[PDB]
Amino acid sequence: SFNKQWYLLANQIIQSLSKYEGGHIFEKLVDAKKQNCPDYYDVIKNPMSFSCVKTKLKKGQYGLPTEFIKDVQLIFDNCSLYNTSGSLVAITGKNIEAYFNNQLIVTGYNNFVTKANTINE
């Protein structure tokens, strides 16, 4: 059914991000002390990781396909906010962001976004 179909696609997309070269740095929430960034949660007020999104998909927390996108994009927005442009981490976030936006097209996920935006308008 409709929601089952884009839940399955979102699970496939998120797993492809996890397996992207360097994607492991977004898999879990940043450990401020262990990663030597003690000010991280002073800057990032809405943290997000791939495993957070996977948990929301597993538990059924998303009601609209755009909610999945907003969370994944939040990962990359947090990355660009905290990390200086050109740094290793910022470069990796820009790369996976571009990969994610292309996957939303080639999988057809954006088609579910368009349908759902019309249903709930």
Q: Which residue ranges make up the site for ligand A1IUX (CB under 6 A)? A: 25-26, 30, 35, 37, 40, 79, 82-83, 89
Q: Output the smallest distance, CB 79 to ligand A1IUX, in A.
A: 5
How would DSSP label each residue in 38-86?
TTHHHH-SS---HHHHHHHHHHT--SSHHHHHHHHHHHHHHHHHHSPTT
CB nearer to ligand A1IUX: pick between 1 and 84 = 84
The amino acid that residue 13 corresponds to is I
C-beta separation of 121 from 18 below 8 A = no
Q: Output the smallest distance, CB 21 to ligand A1IUX, in A.
A: 13
CB nearer to ligand A1IUX: pick between 25 and 113 = 25
